[PDB]
Scaffold this motif. Structure first.
Motif, PDB file in Angstrom:
ATOM      1  N   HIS A   1      -1.733   1.180 -12.242  1.00  0.00           N
ATOM      2  CA  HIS A   1      -0.586   0.824 -11.426  1.00  0.00           C
ATOM      3  C   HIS A   1       0.710   1.104 -12.181  1.00  0.00           C
ATOM      4  O   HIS A   1       0.714   1.555 -13.328  1.00  0.00           O
ATOM      5  CB  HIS A   1      -0.670  -0.643 -11.004  1.00  0.00           C
ATOM      6  CG  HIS A   1      -1.764  -0.927 -10.024  1.00  0.00           C
ATOM      7  ND1 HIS A   1      -1.787  -0.383  -8.758  1.00  0.00           N
ATOM      8  CD2 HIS A   1      -2.873  -1.695 -10.125  1.00  0.00           C
ATOM      9  CE1 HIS A   1      -2.865  -0.804  -8.121  1.00  0.00           C
ATOM     10  NE2 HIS A   1      -3.541  -1.603  -8.929  1.00  0.00           N
TER      11      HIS A   1
ATOM     12  N   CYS B   1       1.606  -5.025  -7.758  1.00  0.00           N
ATOM     13  CA  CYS B   1       0.887  -4.156  -6.838  1.00  0.00           C
ATOM     14  C   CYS B   1      -0.058  -4.987  -5.980  1.00  0.00           C
ATOM     15  O   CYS B   1      -0.825  -5.803  -6.502  1.00  0.00           O
ATOM     16  CB  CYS B   1       0.106  -3.093  -7.608  1.00  0.00           C
ATOM     17  SG  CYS B   1      -0.901  -2.020  -6.571  1.00  0.00           S
TER      18      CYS B   1
ATOM     19  N   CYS C   1      -0.462   4.321  -4.402  1.00  0.00           N
ATOM     20  CA  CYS C   1       0.479   3.343  -3.868  1.00  0.00           C
ATOM     21  C   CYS C   1       1.656   3.133  -4.811  1.00  0.00           C
ATOM     22  O   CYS C   1       2.782   2.881  -4.365  1.00  0.00           O
ATOM     23  CB  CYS C   1      -0.246   2.025  -3.604  1.00  0.00           C
ATOM     24  SG  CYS C   1      -1.181   1.411  -5.024  1.00  0.00           S
ATOM     25  N   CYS C   2       1.417   3.226  -6.118  1.00  0.00           N
ATOM     26  CA  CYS C   2       2.481   3.146  -7.106  1.00  0.00           C
ATOM     27  C   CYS C   2       3.026   4.513  -7.492  1.00  0.00           C
ATOM     28  O   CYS C   2       4.083   4.586  -8.128  1.00  0.00           O
ATOM     29  CB  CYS C   2       1.982   2.426  -8.367  1.00  0.00           C
ATOM     30  SG  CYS C   2       1.107   0.874  -8.062  1.00  0.00           S
TER      31      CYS C   2
ATOM     32  N   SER D   1      -2.603  -3.949  -4.329  1.00  0.00           N
ATOM     33  CA  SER D   1      -3.992  -3.575  -4.576  1.00  0.00           C
ATOM     34  C   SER D   1      -4.593  -4.433  -5.682  1.00  0.00           C
ATOM     35  O   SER D   1      -5.670  -5.015  -5.517  1.00  0.00           O
ATOM     36  CB  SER D   1      -4.083  -2.091  -4.930  1.00  0.00           C
ATOM     37  OG  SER D   1      -3.791  -1.280  -3.806  1.00  0.00           O
TER      38      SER D   1
HETATM   39 ZN   LIG Z   1      -0.860   0.252  -7.004  1.00  0.00          ZN
END
Ligand SMILES: [Zn+2]
Ligand SMILES: [Zn+2]
Ligand SMILES: [Zn+2]
Ligand SMILES: [Zn+2]
Lengths: 386, 386, 386, 386
Positions: free
Chosen positions: A66, B72, A93-94, B74
């Motif tokens: 992340h 995050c 996502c990051c 996730s």
């Molecule tokens: Zn992430």
């Protein structure tokens, strides 16, 4: 088997060997891990910061890495490189926010790259009329050419007023050769300045192909075309075109105006948006002109004589001008003109937000760049004072 | 009784047994807690990250679980699932931001779900005219049909100009059968292309019910209706309607224009806003037309002959057109027209911000999607290079 | 003397006694500190989270207490209250953001306070016409009254069209008693519905003083005033006013329109902005009308006969209407009209951003509230399923 | 050689001596490091917070110091000063955000500096008409002068209406000396108030040079110039100018209107934007007027008699007024007017976003300042209650 401690400076971290050895390519998955081993303490002492090492260890645990939003990307990628990691495996996502931060930093990077190139006979005068405040005589040339552009524009406007250069009388004594003399003078200074710029230009091709050079040449050339054509009498026709083209001298103010250059840049950036504006505008104009022509065709003395004649009404209504020289007289024509006004408002307002946002962002870039330069100079002075 | 240590990797955590055993449903409230017990160290070693475990322990202390903004999601929900927790018990003040983050991530999730379906005789040609850059002959068909749409539109516009197809003379020799021939050709290519699309369509129902198919059929059908009706003479009336409907061929450019599709999508999304616009517009029009009619009814030769006749003045004034063919002559009429202009400006400007925001957000979605695809391809190439 | 350890769960903290004892009012500055003392470990074990305790200890060190932005305010003020601290001593640079977070949370708090009051003979029917989807017959009443409002508005509009109710002939047989009968019916249903609402209202004063009740009564009363006045003949004058007031029945749609209520609320919120709009508008109108009158006073047949007569030109020009019935003919008049157009554009555009922002924020509040209700119901169902 | 532990309160930190001694100028690189040495524990105990010390140690490791976004700048620079560091060495990627936070805090600092100066015979009355709510008689003066300004404006407007002060008859008995008497009275109160303000002003130069004083004097002086000139008969000419200048009395409402002062401030701030607006506007006007004149010069009875005469058409079209008194009749004129409307819309809309943003930000500053004052008073009361 057991767990090993691999403490970063201060805060300790402990993990099982199997997890740490999943990826042998990195620094911590190879013999470098054994290199950091300490005697009588079995602690792998890394002289780094623990916050990024937390994410590194998290990447070692799972198959996912992340990116903390509340951190400096310079420190983040320094710890990535130091530990043998790559920025191309930090999830998805990051990953996008990481790319946004990287591009924001790279913007400053290329800003400094453009700044550091600040810095010989001929080219010295080229440095004169490239930043107006470098010298004193260069500023004199700047103001002189601005004044000459202004006086040329004013003379071109005044040449058409009655009793100024066009007589309203019949037999009394009002033309002026002085207007021709002033035009000759203005073209003389304009071509002298352009020739000096061309001579002092380090690269003739880059200078000539530039937009400013072509603007200058299209502003100055009409006088020469006119003097050449005077050998073929003073018949009308193209004379009106030559008179019209003299207004292009007002475009030379883009040297004297930062806003003009910013507007040009923001029009260049929004080329797709302006193309879509033109396409949707002409589509709506065709549709509404066809409908209005067929609704207003059979009136008593209607001016809707054809769809091209209805283009005028459609463009007047869509921009909310409303001259009133062409108005619908039937119920269908009135309904469709009422719809046309709102639809044209919508079409015009579709890309104006994007144009506004681009102009505002370019303007903000300009102020941010000048503020960054000033604050960098101030910081350099302050650090030199200590 | 006492406190037990339940350290996460590196950083230690200690708490009383009673607090830890409040919720036996979770992993840490059950025999899994005893499973992690280690010999001669009494430390429950969890190979996770400590930051989320802090929030987990906070949830164990109180009856409230929070969500850190600087993390995050996730990792957050991975630690929730790993520890036997549910995302439906994370408070309410932090729950909404968690839902916003989840929906932002799910947007990328369904974007990848739409991406991964990229991928046989007949349907191959259907793949031809579905992405214009897949082949070379498909691009030829794309440009050919665009050129034919353009020439049909141009011919339809030009057919009404005097001396082009409509004679302005009285007895001299200017109609053209060539216009009919060009219309026949354009309809021929249009119907051939539509028939090929229908034949190559994997699902006939999905294709036919689509907006593009109905647009194509309503563009091509008027010619066939006209040829059928020619058996019943060439009397006027519906002939004007058939001529009008030929302008719908310009709507076929939505294949060639991404902006047209984006505008259609943003009009679909703002259906409630456009409905409110229409409702408030007609309400204000009725009110102001009634007031203006009753104020201007008793003038000398006023054109305010009825409230429907005042609809025209109200719609012209509210859009700031101002044709001037109908102007109030009394004090009350002037006051209410002055109020009407501003009120119409307000009514029109009420939903334009929402339409602008929706169009801008859809446009930004398009660029973000294409940028994500390009950067994903670049990342795949880079990770394949190592 | 020495330093004492006062560890929070897991992470240890140590500090000198003198700093810890600076403020005896708080929990940690009093005998509660000695209460937490543990035997053979001299550790003050607090079963809280360490992140907020860091800020608490920082407040103990200096005379300043900060607020971390990346934290939940519920946890923050819980730790403040638990440790005997007050939210009124958290600096000033962090105090404003803390207040913003508190007001954002309190917005949800009062939203839940308005939600939880959802919940007997007579008032049951009041619950009928207060949420249209509660029952089936209440929805029937809702649609019936909407249809009657619509038909009344349509009849009022149509009553003035020639050959519909007003004869354009001279001696032929076109008035209608049917219009009077339809008006009687519409007023009958309107007053019956209003009387039922008044009877079923739990509080007669609150209902009557409400805006909707006064709107209903001013919509229904004109018919009764007209029938009363018919005893005093059918002379004109106030008859036009009674006819005009019948358009107020269209305001009853605010029950059927959420957007109308949102617009009313956003006009109520921006009362100061609308007042400033009116003040600046009338100031500019007076200034420009005076200047235009004195510039255009001495023309041949100018319509600028007075400053009140120039109010019309000024208001037409400032709104960019441009009827053209009054145009300046002198150089000064043209210059000042050119300035007036831009100045009026500026004056109008001054508070439109604020009105737009308020309407958008109220609309977003509506969607956020309904989304919160739906997601709370879904979360309740999900937690009931487990 | 080895590593030394330099723990902050609670959390421990350890590092090698060589890295810690790279910079001897700071506190930790000098004998102060040896001062903090503790006996039998070899721990350098710093009574600070560990989060900022992490960044300090990171700066000691590399040559780069970062800035955490999720922290208070007061604590950050307190730890910088305490450890002998300077804010001018915190990188560049983090430096700009640090400067933004510092300027945001300094805004509140100078707001408090302007607040704390709240606080003797003569100047007491100056405190009367400087904040209207300080006393009761000062508010009476405020309302009296507002009423007199309003009545003067109303009288100036009404003086020009027919049958009010200008006769429409021929030989019947309608001028009024009462208008002159009312003007004398209004000027009397105006000059008395201005003289009292000048007398009570602590600084005569600062008061006189102020904008409000010059506005008051230019509003009151025309009456005195008129009475002086009446000795030289009542000939027309400058009499119209004296009549026009009487409308400036409406500018005195800026004392009574906060919005007027905010608008003045936001016009002062956007001086460059208004200058660019004027420059681009006049450039476009010149270009389009030249093109329109040369396109429409050779019509039958065209009103495009010169480029100055085409300035009127260009300014009417660019603002979307569309009076219709001058419309193009040729194809080229129509095309260029169609382009001119859109181009003028673009030119006008270029700086309106900046003006709107500046006005909105100044308005938000006003509300934030008053809210900060109110909440500071409330916090002072609450802390006094405990
Ligand atoms: Zn992430
Ligand atoms: Zn929370
Ligand atoms: Zn602070
Ligand atoms: Zn940095």
């Amino acid at each position: 088997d057991a767990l090993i401690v691999l403490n970063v400076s201060g805060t300790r971290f402990q993990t099982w060997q199997d997890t740490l050895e999943r990826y042998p390519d990195t620094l911590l998955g190879s013999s470098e891990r054994d290199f950091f081993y300490h005697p009588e303490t079995q602690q792998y002492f890394f002289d780094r910061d623990p916050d990024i090492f937390r994410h590194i260890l998290n990447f070692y645990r799972t198959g996912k890495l992340h990116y903390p939003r509340h951190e400096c990307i310079s420190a983040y990628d320094e710890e990535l490189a130091f530990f043998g990691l790559i920025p191309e495996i930090i999830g998805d996502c990051c990953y996008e926010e990481y790319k946004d931060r990287r591009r924001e930093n790279a913007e400053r990077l290329q800003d400094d790259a453009d700044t550091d190139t600040a810095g010989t006979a001929r080219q010295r005068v080229w440095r004169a009329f490239e930043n107006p405040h470098t010298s004193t005589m260069a500023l004199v040339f700047y103001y002189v050419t601005g004044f000459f552009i202004a006086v040329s524009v004013i003379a071109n406007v005044v040449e058409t007023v009655p009793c100024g250069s066009s007589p309203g009388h019949i037999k009394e004594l009002r033309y002026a050769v002085a207007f021709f003399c002033l035009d000759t003078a203005c073209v003389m200074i304009f071509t002298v300045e352009y020739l000096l710029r061309l001579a002092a230009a380090p690269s003739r091709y880059r200078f000539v192909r530039s937009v400013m050079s072509i603007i200058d040449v299209v502003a100055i050339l009409p006088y020469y075309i006119g003097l050449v054509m005077t050998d073929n009498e003073d018949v009308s026709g193209a004379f009106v075109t030559l008179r019209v083209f003299r207004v292009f001298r007002i475009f030379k103010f883009s040297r004297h105006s930062q806003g003009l250059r910013i507007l040009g840049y923001t029009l260049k950036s929004c080329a797709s948006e302006l193309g879509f504006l033109l396409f949707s505008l002409t589509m709506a104009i065709i549709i509404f002109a066809t409908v209005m022509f067929y609704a207003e065709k059979g009136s008593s003395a209607s001016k809707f004589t054809s769809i091209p004649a209805a283009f005028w009404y459609t463009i007047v209504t869509m921009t909310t001008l409303g001259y009133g020289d062409m108005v619908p007289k039937t119920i269908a024509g009135k309904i469709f003109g009422s719809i046309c006004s709102l639809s044209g408002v919508l079409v015009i307002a579709l890309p104006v937000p994007v144009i506004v946002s681009n102009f505002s962002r370019i303007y903000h870039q300009n102020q941010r760049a000048d503020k960054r330069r000033a604050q960098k100079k101030a910081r350099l002075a302050r650090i030199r004072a200590a």
